[PDB]
């Protein structure tokens, strides 16, 4: 019906940083060879999308942001073999080309065709499929889900279970998987351990969920916003600490309460100082610290290398270490089988047209994940 | 004979930094409860001893430095049960108290009773057993092997095979063990991998021996002193690179020759910039970088957290990750059984009295390990 033809639809365009999104009419070109056009059904507001606005995460403007979503294939380009019109799908911000050295390596997931390192804001062929006022609008990480319709490369899409509830599983697109994998796959939290989680928003609460699934005996949530404590406790936190309540640095407090330092720490805020602080609070001979938060573009941190020399492990990862195409389907299956919960991360549901209000909820500290419905 | 009495002997004292060592007559107190007095037989000159000289490694002065050595027990204090007079022993700069949370932890080595973090330059009891001109002389990491006799705590000493050649196995006291473990136990080099070793001194060569034993297919040694390449090739390097031959930063060169980044990199020099560079040259998605070198006291480095966020693993270790007391004796046994070689790291042998010439050789870049005999 719309197959093979341009579609005109609503999309929230970010014309310049620091500005509200502009809900306008855009035109979405039909898919080319190995491209897939998807009808968005639900998209979550992740803090990284707000990073495109604030300048924290750099990518070419003007742009259609959004990367945490779920939709239905409207049509496929020639040669696509992994999805079909009608399929429920989850757009993949980190692609899985299956052919590069990282895709072939058993532990890598940062596919070399990503658009994160040298951001082009385009589709794999170097062009855009979006147009607004006669001008080309960039893509965001081969996803751009803040639109009723988007076009993604085949290596940036995964087919999921036809009965999943897309208004929930969209979290697997980013928030939930990132948090969870960080703990279980990257850190590899062990049973009986002591974990410290910095930052209690959506990804942090998912870190907490994974630690709790991993068998952790103590999970310390750290946040400067005490309204975040209750939910953190609800998903697994055994204690919660607000750094503003103490007279000494939080690493001292946490090393004191962990009797010497935690086995696993997680930075899930996106601040150079807490990254350092997170590493330090982990046991000096065998502690592991995972950076999940995105730092302000191009800024460096300062740290004493003796923090590593004594035996500490410092690591980071995009999307909880998950090889995107292969895990997303497994993750939805697991959610279908009640292996984990997504509801705790959803505090607000709004119509896509109220996207600007959804960022206001995020910025004021009132929400965790706001789900936008199309 | 000497048992129970003060021994007068020669020791190389370091009265102040930046000075040559002063061979002087010192008084060695008899061992107290759980202490051991050892007669030194062989001690190697490790770059960290020089760090005490240069101010790079800070510990209380005046001091008897020296920490890579092998001797013979002359007498034991009351309550000692692990070694007896006559045993061949290797002093342990990182103790193994067997009772703290790190000693109990299956992966920690950095025993909480070490004298590395808050240097006191005493024996476990807070007192010194060395006297010179009526003045108390500090110990160095509970070892201080640059003396004909020393007194160590029981948790800082290990009993080894009665027939090992002490003029060779003193290298298991520091150099060899640190290198080799760094590769095989800390980094865990994998068969068929590509490794990059920065620094081709005794430890670095030992890092290369461990990479080659782990099954590495490519081992690139990097040093600004080409005189070091031949020996690095001999123990296993497949290529050698000197950063001064290139007009581009060595991380670029390495990334290019490794077709995108190495699987494991090691900084074995002791510079904040090479630490950063070694991290960068490892593949961004799944590379591992291990800091072995000791950096300038209290100095911080600067690096971009995105090098971690894409997937890299950054870590460090004291003594190749080895639990000191349990591994020293096994390592000597394996050397006894010809599992690994120590001769390649020994380029000079000198009588103890010529300790300042041993340092000269190190500093001029002419030697790897100079072994001092008593
Ligand atoms: N690595 C990945 O693959 C990946 C994926 C998604 C998100 N991220 C990043 O993870 C971070 C978390 O995302 P989110 O969606 O949960 O964000 P969010 O804004 O919902 O959560 C962050 C939380 O940190 C807390 N916080 C802020 N300043 C703090 C301070 N000084 N000390 C302690 N706590 C503080 C806030 O109060 C907030 O609850 C972001 O920076 C985002 O870009 C990374
Ligand atoms: N972590 C531990 O437990 C441990 C144990 C022993 C030694 N160490 C540290 O390891 C380092 C190595 O000790 P070593 O005894 O082998 O020292 P060494 O001095 O024999 O070797 C250092 C090597 O680095 C090379 N080098 C110097 N500057 C360089 C630069 N800018 N770029 C590239 N190469 C450079 C020198 O030419 C030299 O061959 C020291 O810093 C020592 O303190 C750490
Ligand atoms: O939330 C998505 N992202 C984008 C990829 C880098 C980490 C943050
Ligand atoms: O070679 C010995 N050392 C002392 C312990 C810190 C690392 C260097
Ligand atoms: Zn996100
Ligand atoms: Zn790929
Ligand atoms: Zn101990
Ligand atoms: Zn040493």
Burial of A139 (0-12, 13-18, 19+ CB in 10 A): buried
Question: In this complex, is the C-beta atom of B57 within 8 Å of any C-beta atom belonging to chain A?
Answer: no
Give the distance (Å) from ligand 2 centre to CA of residue B200: 7
Residue B133 is labelled as binding a ligand: no
Question: In this complex, is the C-beta atom of B118 within 8 Å of any C-beta atom belonging to chain A?
Answer: no
Q: Per the omega criterion (within 30 degrees of 0), is the bond before A62 cis?
A: yes
To the query of whether residue B367 is one of the catalytic residues in this protein, the response is no
> What residue spans in chain B does CATH classification 3.90.180.10 cover?
1-178+318-374
The one catalytic residue in A75, A144, A170, A174 is: A174
If residue A8 lies in a helix (H) or strand (E), which one and from where to where? strand A7-14
Euclidean distance between the first and the last CA atom of chain A, given in angstroms as a whole number = 20
Task: Flag if A109 and B285 touch (Cβ within 8 Å).
Answer: yes
Which chain B positions have a beta carbon within 8 Å of A110's beta carbon?
Answer: 284-285, 310-311
Q: Per the omega criterion (within 30 degrees of 0), is the bond before B78 cis?
A: no
Q: Which residues pair with B153 in a beta bridge?
A: B35
Name the resolution in angstroms.
2.5
Q: How was this structure determined?
A: X-ray
Q: Which CATH number fits domain B179-317: 3.30.70.2470, 3.40.50.720, 2.40.50.180, 1.10.10.10?
A: 3.40.50.720
Task: Flag if B317 and A294 touch (Cβ within 8 Å).
Answer: no
Nearest partner of A130 among A119, A117, A143, A118, judged by Cα: A143
Residue B240 is labelled as binding a ligand: no
The C-alpha atoms of residue B52 and residue B54 are separated, in whole angstroms, by 6
Nearest partner of B14 among B48, B50, B47, judged by Cα: B50
The C-alpha atoms of residue A147 and residue A26 are separated, in whole angstroms, by 9
Dihedral angle computed from the Cα positions of residues A64, A65, A70 and A75, in that order, rounded to the nearest 10 degrees: 30
Class of domain B1-178+318-374: alpha beta
Closest Cα in chain B to A258: B101
Q: By the 8 A CB rule, do A96 and A324 touch?
A: yes
How far is C-alpha B115 from the geometric centre of its chain's CA atoms? 15
Where is the binding site for an alcohol, in residues of A?
Answer: 48, 67
DSSP state of A138: B
The C-alpha atoms of residue A184 and residue A319 are separated, in whole angstroms, by 12
The C-alpha atoms of residue A269 and residue B226 are separated, in whole angstroms, by 45
Question: In this complex, is the C-beta atom of B110 within 8 Å of any C-beta atom belonging to chain A?
Answer: yes
**CA-to-CA separations, A91 to A43, A174, A338, in angstroms, rounded:** 10, 10, 22
Q: B129-154 b/e with 16+ CB inside 10 Å = b?
A: bbebeeeebbbbbbbbbbbbbbbbbb
The C-alpha atoms of residue B166 and residue B44 are separated, in whole angstroms, by 11
Give the distance (Å) from ligand 5 centre to CA of residue B226: 48
To the query of whether residue A139 is one of the catalytic residues in this protein, the response is no
Q: By the 8 A CB rule, do A169 and A200 touch?
A: no
> What residue spans in chain A does CATH classification 3.40.50.720 cover?
179-317
Which chain B positions have a beta carbon within 8 Å of A283's beta carbon?
Answer: 101-102, 108
Interface of A with B in 234-263 (CB under 8 A): 259-260
Nearest partner of B195 among B226, B240, B227, B229, judged by Cα: B240
- H runs (alpha helix) in chain A: 47-54, 101-104, 166-169, 175-181, 202-214, 229-234, 250-257, 272-281, 306-309, 324-336, 355-364
The bridge status of strand A35-44 relative to strand A313-316 is: unpaired
């Amino acid at each position: 019906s719309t197959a093979g033809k341009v579609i005109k639809c609503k999309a929230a365009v970010l014309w310049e940083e620091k500005k509200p999104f502009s809900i306008e009419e855009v035109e979405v070109a039909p898919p080319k060879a190995h491209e897939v056009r998807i009808k968005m059904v639900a998209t979550g507001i992740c803090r990284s999308d707000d990073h495109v606005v604030s300048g924290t995460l750099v990518t070419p403007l003007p742009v259609i942001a959004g990367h945490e979503a779920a939709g239905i294939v409207e049509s496929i380009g020639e040669g696509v073999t992994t999805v079909r019109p009608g399929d429920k799908v989850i757009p993949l911000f980190t692609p899985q080309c299956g052919k590069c050295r990282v895709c072939k390596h058993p532990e890598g997931n940062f596919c070399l065709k990503n658009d994160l390192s040298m951001p082009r804001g385009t589709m794999q062929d170097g062009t855009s499929r979006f147009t607004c006022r006669g001008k080309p609008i960039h893509h965001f990480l081969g996803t751009s889900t803040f639109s009723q319709y988007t076009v993604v490369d085949e290596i940036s899409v995964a087919k999921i279970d036809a009965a999943s509830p897309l208004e929930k599983v969209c979290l697997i697109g980013c928030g939930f998987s990132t948090g969870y994998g960080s703990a279980v796959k990257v850190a590899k939290v062990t049973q009986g351990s002591t974990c410290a989680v910095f930052g209690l928003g959506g990804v942090g609460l998912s870190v907490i969920m994974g630690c709790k699934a991993a068998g952790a005996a103590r999970i310390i949530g750290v946040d400067i916003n005490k309204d975040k404590f209750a939910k953190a406790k609800e998903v697994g936190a055994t204690e919660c600490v607000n750094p503003q309540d103490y007279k000494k640095p939080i690493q001292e407090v946490l090393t004191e309460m962990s009797n010497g330092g935690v086995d696993f720490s997680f930075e899930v805020i996106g601040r150079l100082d807490t990254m350092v602080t997170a590493l330090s609070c982990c046991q000096e001979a065998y502690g592991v610290s995972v950076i999940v938060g995105v730092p302000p573009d191009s800024q460096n941190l300062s740290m004493n290398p003796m923090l590593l020399l004594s035996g500490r492990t410092w690591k980071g990862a995009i999307f909880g270490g998950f090889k995107s195409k292969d895990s997303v389907p497994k993750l939805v299956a697991d959610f279908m089988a009640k292996k984990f919960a997504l509801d705790p991360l959803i505090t607000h549901v709004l119509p896509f047209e109220k996207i600007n209000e959804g960022f206001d909820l995020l910025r004021s500290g009132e929400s965790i994940r706001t789900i936008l419905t199309f």
